[PDB]
Design an enzyme around this catalytic site. Structure first.
Site, PDB file in Angstrom:
ATOM      1  N   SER A 211       0.811  -1.238   0.000  1.00  0.00           N
ATOM      2  CA  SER A 211       0.000   0.000   0.000  1.00  0.00           C
ATOM      3  C   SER A 211       0.846   1.291   0.000  1.00  0.00           C
ATOM      4  O   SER A 211       0.221   2.389  -0.151  1.00  0.00           O
ATOM      5  CB  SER A 211      -0.959  -0.060   1.137  1.00  0.00           C
TER       6      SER A 211
ATOM      7  N   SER B 216      -5.873   3.319   3.825  1.00  0.00           N
ATOM      8  CA  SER B 216      -5.323   2.290   2.894  1.00  0.00           C
ATOM      9  C   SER B 216      -6.426   1.569   2.126  1.00  0.00           C
ATOM     10  O   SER B 216      -6.228   0.371   1.811  1.00  0.00           O
ATOM     11  CB  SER B 216      -4.441   1.290   3.620  1.00  0.00           C
TER      12      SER B 216
ATOM     13  N   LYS C 173       2.675   6.518   5.499  1.00  0.00           N
ATOM     14  CA  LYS C 173       1.854   5.526   4.767  1.00  0.00           C
ATOM     15  C   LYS C 173       2.485   4.148   5.001  1.00  0.00           C
ATOM     16  O   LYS C 173       3.681   3.956   4.707  1.00  0.00           O
ATOM     17  CB  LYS C 173       1.774   5.868   3.281  1.00  0.00           C
TER      18      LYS C 173
ATOM     19  N   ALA D 290       1.291  -3.618   3.929  1.00  0.00           N
ATOM     20  CA  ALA D 290       1.260  -5.021   4.359  1.00  0.00           C
ATOM     21  C   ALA D 290       0.845  -5.847   3.157  1.00  0.00           C
ATOM     22  O   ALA D 290      -0.084  -5.431   2.447  1.00  0.00           O
ATOM     23  CB  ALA D 290       0.289  -5.190   5.523  1.00  0.00           C
TER      24      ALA D 290
ATOM     25  N   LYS E 247       0.296   3.988  -2.725  1.00  0.00           N
ATOM     26  CA  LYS E 247      -0.938   4.816  -2.778  1.00  0.00           C
ATOM     27  C   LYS E 247      -0.547   6.291  -2.656  1.00  0.00           C
ATOM     28  O   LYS E 247      -1.225   7.130  -3.241  1.00  0.00           O
ATOM     29  CB  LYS E 247      -1.940   4.341  -1.717  1.00  0.00           C
TER      30      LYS E 247
ATOM     31  N   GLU F 237      -5.030  -3.756  -6.925  1.00  0.00           N
ATOM     32  CA  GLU F 237      -5.467  -4.354  -5.640  1.00  0.00           C
ATOM     33  C   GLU F 237      -6.446  -5.472  -5.958  1.00  0.00           C
ATOM     34  O   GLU F 237      -7.333  -5.294  -6.798  1.00  0.00           O
ATOM     35  CB  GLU F 237      -6.028  -3.270  -4.725  1.00  0.00           C
TER      36      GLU F 237
END
Length: 264
Positions: free
Chosen positions: A46, A106, A210, A213, A49, A142
Site C-alpha cells: 500500500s 489504505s 503511509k 502489508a 498509494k 489491488e
C-alpha cells in the site's frame, strides 16, 4: 555516521529471519544519512498509494483532473479491505475523498478507482519514470499487487528509489505548493500506522506516513518526520519473507523508529 540504528536493522533481520531495507534522508538537501540494502527490491504494497495520489495531484495542477469530480461505482468494484468506499455505493466519492481513503485508511477499492483515472498501473510507472525514478514499477491492481513472490520485480521499489521519489513529491519542483501541502496533509492523518513509527514518536514531533502489508510477511512504511512540529527527514523501512507475527513485524519497525529518533 553512528552504528546504533543499523545494529537495530540487523537485529530486526535476525529476529524476523528476513531482509529489511532502510533509508534515512534529509528532506531539503536529499542527502542520505544512512541506509541498509538501499538497492534491493521490496514489494511496495500500500506504500504505492502515496505515489498514486502524487500522480493524481500532478493532473489536478495541469487541469486534467478536479479534486471535486464525483465518481460512482458498484458492488462489483469493491475488493477486500474497502472500509470507506463500501459506504458510498449510492452517493459515490470525490477524487479528494478517494485519495483520503487510499492514504488515511489504505482503502483498496479507492486505489483501484484512482488507478483507473490515470489509465492503470503501467501509467503510474510512466509518471514515476518521467519524474526521474527508473526503478519503481507498479504492474498490478489491488489486491494482486501484494503477492510478494520471491525474486518477482512486479510492484516493487528499492528503499533508495522510494525515499528519493517521496522527497521529490513532498518538497521537489513537480507539484504546486497547494498539491504538496494536500499530499502531506493526507499522510499526516494516516489512521492505520499506529503501531509503526508513530508508536515511537515523541509528543511534539511531526509525522506524515503511509504503511503497507502484503503476503509472505511483507510489511513497510514511508514517512516524513521530525522534531518541533515540522518534517525534516524521510524514512523508508521495508521487510519481506518473514514468517513472524504482524505484531513482531510492527515491533521491529517501531524499534528501528525508536533508534533513529534517539540518534537524530
Amino acid at each position: 555516521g553512528h552504528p546504533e540504528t543499523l545494529v537495530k536493522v540487523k537485529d530486526a533481520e535476525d529476529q524476523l529471519g528476513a531482509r529489511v531495507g532502510y533509508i534515512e534522508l534529509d528532506l531539503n538537501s536529499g542527502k542520505i544519512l544512512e541506509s541498509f540494502r538501499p538497492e534491493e527490491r521490496f514489494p511496495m504494497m500500500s506504500t504505492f498509494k502515496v505515489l498514486l495520489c502524487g500522480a493524481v495531484l500532478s493532473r489536478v495542477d495541469a487541469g486534467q483532473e478536479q479534486l471535486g469530480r464525483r465518481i460512482h461505482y458498484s458492488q462489483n468494484d469493491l475488493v477486500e479491505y474497502s472500509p470507506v468506499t463500501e459506504k458510498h455505493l449510492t452517493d459515490g466519492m470525490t477524487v479528494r475523498e478517494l485519495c483520503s481513503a487510499a492514504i488515511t485508511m489504505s482503502d483498496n477499492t479507492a486505489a483501484n478507482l484512482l488507478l483507473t483515472t490515470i489509465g492503470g498501473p503501467k501509467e503510474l510507472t510512466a509518471f514515476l519514470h518521467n519524474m526521474g525514478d527508473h526503478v519503481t514499477r507498479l504492474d498490478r491492481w489491488e489486491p494482486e499487487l501484494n503477492e510478494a513472490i520471491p525474486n518477482d520485480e512486479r510492484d516493487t521499489t528499492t528503499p533508495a528509489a522510494m525515499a528519493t521519489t517521496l522527497r521529490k513529491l513532498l518538497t521537489g519542483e513537480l507539484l504546486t505548493l497547494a498539491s504538496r501541502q494536500q499530499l502531506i496533509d493526507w499522510m499526516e492523518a494516516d489512521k492505520v500506522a499506529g503501531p509503526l513509527l508513530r508508536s515511537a514518536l515523541p509528543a511534539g514531533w511531526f509525522i506524515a506516513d503511509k504503511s503497507g502489508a502484503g503476503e509472505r510477511g511483507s510489511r513497510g512504511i514511508i514517512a516524513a518526520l521530525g522534531p518541533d512540529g515540522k518534517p525534516s527527514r524521510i524514512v523508508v523501512i521495508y521487510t519481506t519473507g518473514s514468517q513472524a507475527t504482524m505484531d513482531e513485524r510492527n515491533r521491529q519497525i517501531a524499534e528501528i523508529g525508536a533508534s533513529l529518533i534517539k540518534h537524530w
